[PDB]
Amino acid sequence: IRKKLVIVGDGACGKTCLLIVFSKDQFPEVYVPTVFENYVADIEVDGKQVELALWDTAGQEDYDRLRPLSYPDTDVILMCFSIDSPDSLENIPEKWTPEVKHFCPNVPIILVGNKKDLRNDEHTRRELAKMKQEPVKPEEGRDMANRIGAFGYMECSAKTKDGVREVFEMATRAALQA
């Protein structure tokens, strides 16, 4: 039993960091833009040992053309965003939700909050002070997922590796059922 999933986000938000940490338990040191990556990992949930295949996407304009490569029918398609950037909270769910529905319906979605560790960092407040912004609140994270009709909401931290394993457990179980 092998499942399939696809992950999208706002770019430079931790889409690649989440997978490397989960599959390698090592936080990336040097950032490199990602075009298209495929990973395979094994996870046991509720006594079910199911192979998990991860499909990595990109949001850059030059890489927006080849998004349909990983779109075709899959058990689940996940969603990710940067908690530090309120912009990703609005545009990304609205940008990709019609795209996900159009390309492959009947695919449950999960909303994942990235960069949770630095949400309390002092540097974030100063940087967002110039732009008149604040870190994405937990309350709006759950509400946004409900607005786009998703399976649920979660938050992850690549550096601290806190809550990362939870998303896969919840995501994998949904794939087999329904």
Binding site: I20, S23, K24, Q26, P28, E29, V30, V32, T34, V35, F36, E37, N38, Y39, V40, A53, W55, D62, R65, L66, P68, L69, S70, P72
Partner: protein, 887 residues
């Protein structure tokens, strides 16, 4: 553009290649209508097609130079006299102005295309055409033809609708086997080739597993087939990293089930360095490459410049290393004529032969082709048959006696042999005459032979050795470019039953028979004996073999013996030759018009030794040095007096094993075709709905006693239809060790470009305890053993190089090996007793997180054979050996 015959393959003179490209005015002659017209033939910008039209069908048509089999000048079919009167031209010589192109799509269809042009035009037209066909001749013998498949497919898309554009991604992906999918559009050839590569590297899981085991975490940042034709090799530069990532991305997403998804993690990339790659060649491949050669492989296969610079080999480099033409199973690929094997007498060689060359199909109702003699002789066949019966006008006509098959003039069949006898090969051809002709005509059958062949025909003993006390037939090398005919020679002082030749034979035709004096088989139960070449139908030879097997082997090793299918095979089928090849029979005549298994064995056997048609017989025969000379009885059902050489075969996976059938359930059947003691078949469990990259991973073990003559046969079979769709027959003696690719072929024994199989084949061996002797030692003659050599890599050798390969004899021991290592370093005074060879076993494993297990150590005691220990390393157990020198 997209030259169908690339520039790096052609060897045409610049001026000559321009003349064909620009065009010329020539007269097109049509034999069927027997009316010549004027035309203007031009060579298309792609060097494949020839097109002729009315100058500024008879005058409208197109020829595909990938179907031309040969080009002749002054083919007697052209009627220069008819052309001159039709075109009111002055006197012309056909041997100076005629051009012909024998082309066809099958071994039974051989058309003709006639062009006659002025003297000056003929030279350039023919000279250029010969080079174009020669390139076509080579391109269809290349082992790896992945690129030549893309050229045809791309150009076919280019001209499919009449609109000059490439194929869309949906079509490109589908053609390569990817998912049946929009965004992109017509793609240039480079973007098309660069997509196939991603499909051949991202669709092979089995090459990822063989990479994980031997990889190390070394970070990411610090006359043959021309290399430009080889898709995999790096020098085939004839796109930025951004495009390549897209190409791999789409390829890795289109594959369905078995695919090495494009994993890209920084600071966590693995590789196969110089030392790591060496451990892969020493144990699995068995290849022993020096430090420079191993490094040269790194510089030649690794795509990434960063990796290639720091002596690493990423997955693309390693995956592309196992798909190269140097990692194909058969050693017969790119095999050239070996002039040393062609020195023994002619009785010791298996000679390629055909039974009814003139017939093109059924042998009781069908056509007789004059040009099928040229088609067969181009394949390399070295023996042919002529059923000269009787001329209604007095000139003999060849056909199947007392049957409805069409009659062809004899004069045009002897000519057909001459124009194409020695085009491919140069070894002598033995012509067999079923001379059903009255005395008067045989005089007109002897003039034709001497008039046409002239010097090629043998009229008298050409070599002094033929006058010895007990002469033997001359070596095939001595008779190079010669023709010998065989039939009854004068003794100097409902099924048609037409086998009886003419009772009386002319004294002119018989005088031409020299080295093959056919006579009725005297028997084994009952001039020198080395000349008489009998001819026994399969039933008579098969019956003779079983009753007198041992007697026959010592008979056919001193005189030839021909065999042809039985008369009962009106279907025009073939007998299985392995029954006769074991006993030394040389001329096993076969029906080349029918393509069945018995004809693939003949093709498989004779593709070796350069394809000359003469393959030396196993040394157990014809050799008095072999300890098993007179004791070999192939028909015996059980011989427990020797230890066979156990063989292990593993069908790891296959790629595109069902061409044109995306949906299928292929299973590979491996049949060992040898004696009745070591012949067996195996079946791999079917894999459903997967032909792009099926992966069964079965293992098969078989023991072979007489390994000199055994033919493996891999045959893809769809369980849904139970119909073969790709087969390949290779001798076990010509099967490379280790992880090698096998190139499959279709039912007509034509090369499938993309289809192949990935197999692991290691020749194990049992330990000789003295009770019984190894099979290899017995059959293999003592003299041939001296020619055997082995290379062993020793680490820690003095000098900058981490290791070096030393060539040693089979019997070399550890004591000698120390002297060889210390022999090189004469500058430093070193004592042999100081050094001692040590054997290591590095317990590498797919798992890398855990700490490496300590390498096992041992001391190679003196007098212990060093080749023997090298054969004890089984990487299946998870360890890779090293012969390391230490103080």
């Amino acid at each position: 553009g997209t030259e169908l015959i690339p520039w790096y393959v052609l060897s045409i003179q610049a001026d000559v290649h321009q003349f064909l490209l620009q065009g010329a005015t020539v007269i097109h002659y049509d034999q069927d209508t027997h009316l010549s017209a004027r035309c203007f033939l031009q060579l298309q910008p792609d060097n494949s097609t020839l097109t002729w039209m009315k100058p500024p069908g008879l005058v409208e048509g197109i020829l595909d130079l990938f179907s031309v089999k040969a080009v002749y000048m002054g083919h007697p079919g052209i009627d220069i006299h008819t052309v001159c009167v039709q075109n009111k031209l002055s006197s012309m010589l056909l041997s100076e102005t005629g051009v012909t192109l024998l082309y066809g799509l099958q071994t039974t269809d051989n058309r003709l295309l006639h062009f006659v042009a002025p003297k000056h035009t003929a030279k350039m037209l023919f000279s250029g055409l010969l080079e174009l066909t020669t390139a076509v001749r080579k391109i269809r013998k290349f082992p790896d033809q992945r690129q030549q498949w893309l050229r045809k497919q791309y150009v076919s898309f280019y001209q499919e609708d009449g609109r000059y554009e490439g194929p869309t991604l949906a079509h490109a992906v589908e053609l390569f086997g990817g998912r049946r999918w929009v965004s992109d559009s017509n793609m240039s050839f480079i973007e098309f080739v660069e997509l196939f590569k991603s499909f051949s590297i991202r669709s092979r899981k089995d090459l990822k597993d063989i990479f994980d085991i031997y990889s190390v975490p070394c970070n990411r940042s610090a006359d043959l087939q021309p290399d430009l034709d080889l898709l995999t090799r790096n020098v085939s530069d004839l796109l930025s990293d951004n495009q390549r990532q897209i190409s791999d991305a789409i390829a890795a997403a289109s594959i369905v089930t078995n695919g090495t998804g494009i994993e890209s993690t920084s600071l966590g990339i693995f590789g196969v360095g110089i030392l790591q790659l060496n451990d892969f060649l020493v144990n699995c491949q068995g290849e022993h490459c020096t430090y420079d050669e191993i490094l040269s492989i790194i510089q030649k296969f690794e795509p990434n410049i960063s990796m290639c610079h720091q002596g690493l080999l990423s997955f693309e480099g390693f995956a592309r290393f196992l798909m190269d033409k140097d990692n194909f199973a058969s050693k017969n690929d790119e095999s050239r004529e070996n002039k040393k094997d062609l020195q023994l007498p002619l009785s010791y060689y298996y000679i390629e032969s055909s039974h009814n060359t003139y017939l093109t199909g059924h042998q009781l109702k069908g056509e007789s082709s004059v040009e099928l003699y040229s088609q067969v002789l181009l394949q390399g066949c070295r023996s042919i048959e002529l059923d000269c019966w009787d001329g209604d006008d007095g000139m003999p006509i060849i056909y199947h006696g007392h049957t409805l098959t069409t009659k062809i003039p004899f004069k045009e069949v002897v000519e057909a042999i001459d124009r194409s006898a020695f085009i491919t090969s140069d070894l002598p051809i033995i012509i067999s005459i079923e001379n059903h002709c009255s005395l008067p005509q045989q005089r007109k059958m002897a003039e034709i032979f001497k008039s046409v062949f002239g010097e090629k025909l043998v009229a008298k003993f050409l070599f002094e050795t033929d006058f010895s006390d007990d002469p033997m037939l001359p070596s095939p090398d001595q008779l190079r470019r010669k023709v010998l005919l065989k039939n009854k020679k004068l003794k100097a002082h409902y099924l048609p039953q037409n086998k009886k030749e003419s009772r009386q034979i002319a004294p002119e035709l018989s005088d031409l028979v020299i080295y093959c004096q056919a006579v009725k088989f005297p028997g084994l139960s009952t001039t020198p004996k080395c000349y008489h070449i009998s001819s026994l139908n399969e039933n008579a030879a098969k019956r003779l073999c079983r009753r007198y097997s041992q007697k026959l082997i010592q008979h056919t090793a001193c005189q030839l013996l021909r065999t042809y299918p039985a008369a009962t095979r009106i279907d025009s089928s073939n007998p299985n030759p392995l029954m006769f090849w074991l006993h030394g029979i040389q001329l096993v005549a076969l029906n080349y018009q029918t393509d069945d298994l018995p004809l693939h064995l003949n093709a498989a056997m004779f593709e070796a030794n350069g394809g000359c048609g003469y393959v030396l017989k196993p040394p157990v025969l014809w050799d008095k040095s072999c300890p098993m000379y007179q004791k070999f009885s192939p028909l015996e059902r059980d011989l427990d007096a020797m230890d066979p050489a156990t063989y292990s075969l593993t069908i790891i996976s296959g790629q595109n094993v069902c061409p044109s059938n995306s949906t299928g359930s292929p299973c590979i059947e491996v049949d060992v075709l040898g004696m009745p003691l070591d012949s067996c078949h195996f079946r791999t469990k079917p894999i459903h709905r997967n032909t792009l990259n099926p992966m069964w991973n079965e293992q098969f073990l078989f023991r072979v006693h007489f390994e000199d003559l055994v033919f493996l046969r891999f045959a893809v079979v769809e369980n849904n239809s139970s119909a073969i769709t790709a087969q390949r027959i290779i001798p076990l003696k010509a099967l490379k060790r280790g992880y090698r690719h096998l190139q499959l072929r279709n039912l007509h024994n034509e090369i499938l470009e993309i289809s192949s199989l990935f197999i692991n084949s290691r020749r194990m061996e049992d330990n000789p305890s003295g009770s019984t002797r190894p099979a290899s030692l017995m059959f293999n003659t003592e003299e041939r053993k001296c020619s055997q050599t082995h290379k062993v890599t020793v680490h820690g050798v003095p000098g900058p190089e981490p290791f070096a390969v030393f060539t040693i004899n089979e019997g070399t021991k550890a004591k000698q090996l120390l002297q060889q290592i210390l022999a090189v370093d004469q500058d430093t005074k070193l004592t042999a007793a100081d050094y001692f060879l040590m054997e290591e076993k590095h317990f590498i494993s797919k798992e890398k997180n855990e700490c490496r297990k300590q390498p096992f150590q041992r001391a190679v005691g003196p007098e212990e054979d060093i080749v023997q220990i090298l054969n004890s390393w089984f990487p299946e157990e998870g360890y890779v050996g090293r012969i390391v020198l230490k103080p």
